[PDB]
Amino acid sequence: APGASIFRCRQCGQTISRRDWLLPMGGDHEHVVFNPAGMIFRVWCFSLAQGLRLIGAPSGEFSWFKGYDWTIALCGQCGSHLGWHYEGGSQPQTFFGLIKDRLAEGPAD
Ligand SMILES: Nc1ccc2c(c1)C(=O)N([C@H]1CC(=O)NC1=O)C2=O
Ligand SMILES: [Zn+2]
Numbered sequence: 001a002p003g004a005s006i007f008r009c010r011q012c013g014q015t016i017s018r019r020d021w022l023l024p025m026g027g028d029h030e031h032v033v034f035n036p037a038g039m040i041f042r043v044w045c046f047s048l049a050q051g052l053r054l055i056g057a058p059s060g061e062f063s064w065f066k067g068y069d070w071t072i073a074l075c076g077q078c079g080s081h082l083g084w085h086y087e088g089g090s091q092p093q094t095f096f097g098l099i100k101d102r103l104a105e106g107p108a109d
Contacts, residue, residue, distance in 0.1 A: 004105055005108040006108050007098070008106065009082065009102070011102075012075060012078035012080070014075050015109065016049055017098065019105070022045070022047075023045040029045050033064045035062065042100045045097050047095055049073070051076050052082060052096075053073070054085050055071060055074060058071050063086070067089035068087065070087075080102060082102050082103070083102070084096070084097050
């Protein structure tokens, strides 16, 4: 009965990802970053995620991950901004960077 298994949206409980899907980008699954508006994010990288809605077309502007374009990822249920989907890069071509404090971690369904 593991308690550290599944990540859900902190606001509504939508299933989003899994600890098993953590991805060590540049040797670390955690990346502490800031946006042009100065907001600091503790971003956890995941190979896969579900339950999101990706908004708009990709952009390379200000990307925290060299060679990747990003799209905003909202919770598909409640619209909470959960992070970004990254695409267009290499090894891997795509991944998710999700905001750790916006997810709740718990046991598997
Ligand atoms: N007009 C904007 C408003 C908010 C944000 C961005 C542009 C942007 O690019 N980012 C992140 C996404 C990224 O990969 N690097 C960042 O600084 C944001 O949070
Ligand atoms: Zn939600």
